[PDB]
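[retry 2/3] Pseudin-2: previous attempt timed out, resubmitting with same input.
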Amino acid sequence: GLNALKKVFQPIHEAIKLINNHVQ
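[retry 2/3] Pseudin-2: success.
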């Protein structure tokens, strides 16, 4: 129940940070 996860889940933030750290 992480507010951050639920707050980023809706938006594309999850994808951004994801691929952002994944590209590494």
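[retry 2/3] Pseudin-2: The CA atoms of residues 10 and 17 lie 13 Å apart.
[retry 2/3] clearing retry counter.
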